[PDB]
Symmetry: D2
Subunit: 122 residues, 4 copies
């Protein structure tokens, strides 16, 4: 309910998601950055019965960066929580793993943090 | 290919996954550590057309730590890659986020690394 | 250049640092969050000859959470870069490791991100 | 005492460190991987009065990847703990930040994990 909708992060990427009764997140992700174009399938999970003490709602989702137009041989997982209120927000940290050989595994994973709100960028 | 089946990490957790033709990962996770018991639903994605240059196959999945027995108000995502061969493995790094108040948000996320193999430790 | 001085992050912590000619960072950290009080010693390194292409200046530092008042048996490292300009900032990600038994090692490391500015929040 | 010495990680990198009475780590790092050659200065901190319940000793250190031969405009911090015993070990996770513009900040930080032991590679 509160999670379902269209969200945008600080890069201008577009996160369209539906939070289902079974605890699943399903939708599409469009990244404004990197080796990506148009929409990618996402799937994830969220806590469908969160605490009522003011705590956020834990969640996560994955995008593999392959669609009909491009394959960047990589995947990002976002782990975070939804925080409701006047300015609802999803605060995340993410891990992006690139397909790599063994000589290059050490350099295979980027880390970052994305904040999502429902405010469409200008 | 090669991803579908049962995998074990260094903690003894059991990762049961099916890699579908549409790039989907679907299965169950049983953690040997933390506030967890029995199996939890997992869903994720993998590169269904990986490079042919010897690179691994990038993938990720999520578990929310709620099932019919308990709810630990948290979720873990594993991000990594499958590497095939005689000693196949899925090498991952993970982020566990706990549902938290704003006063405790700074301390809400654990990070780690799990190595999954076809043979238990 | 531009690094030496007092900085504040979004939690209200105070980062007092001197960037030396030898690439060293030296100063004190006062955390507004966690098991911490008063100042802690910090030491780190920065690129003393950064690129001239508009890139930030890479740097990192460590605090062990022991001083003469308390010891929280943990240490944080911040890894990031200084970006100069009208709204200068040091953008970081951090890893806090707690001294832990092997049974709790999987849960020993927190991860986060701190943005430091010259103006308090 | 237990921390002071020469350590090697799974990549074959060489970590020469002295743990001082003031809580400081000082020494040199030589990376077997990446845009690095010869030795780099490191500095860090460790818990000089760790717990006595079997817990490890928390510590961290930083290398900026500039020396007299090369500058890779980047820095790595390792955060971890020393675990004593028959096979003493330093278990770490690390963050490597590369100098970047604003268009590229999202991709500026690699993450990984290094295990150090005193066994010299063959
Ligand atoms: O780029 C992608 C796919 C798109 C990822 C978009 C990322 S997901 C976390 C963050 N949040 C967003 O909303 N968007 C970004 N994958 C590899 C390709 C090789 N990489 C580079 C980087 C820089 N230059 C050249 C090559 C590293 C990343
Ligand atoms: O334990 C779980 C759920 C099971 C996580 C299992 C983890 S997934 C990565 C790793 N790989 C595995 O195979 N297993 C482990 N959630 C905790 C998180 C930490 N929590 C707190 C809260 C307050 N203070 C301290 C800690 C709250 C609940
Ligand atoms: O709090 C501190 C020391 C101060 C850390 C302050 C942190 S540094 C990154 C961030 N940026 C700041 O400016 N401030 C915060 N150490 C804790 C770690 C968590 N600990 C446990 C143990 C068991 N269960 C749960 C948690 C043990 C002690
Ligand atoms: O490489 C370095 C400096 C050496 C880092 C060595 C790393 S520290 C953590 C790990 N533990 C070790 O012992 N060693 C490795 N810095 C940038 C340069 C640009 N980068 C690449 C990567 C791959 N191809 C091309 C360019 C990313 C990294």
């Amino acid at each position: 309910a509160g999670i379902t909708g269209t969200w945008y992060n600080q890069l201008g990427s577009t996160f369209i998601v539906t939070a289902g009764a079974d605890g699943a997140l399903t939708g599409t992700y469009e990244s404004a950055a990197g080796k990506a174009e148009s929409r990618y399938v996402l799937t994830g999970r969220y806590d469908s019965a969160p605490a009522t003490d003011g705590s956020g709602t834990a969640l996560g989702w994955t995008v593999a960066w392959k669609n009909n137009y491009r394959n960047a041989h990589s995947a990002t997982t976002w782990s975070g929580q939804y925080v409701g209120g006047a300015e609802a927000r999803i605060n995340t940290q993410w891990l992006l793993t690139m397909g790599a050989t063994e000589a290059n595994g050490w350099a295979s994973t980027l880390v970052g943090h994305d904040t999502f709100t429902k405010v469409k960028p200008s």
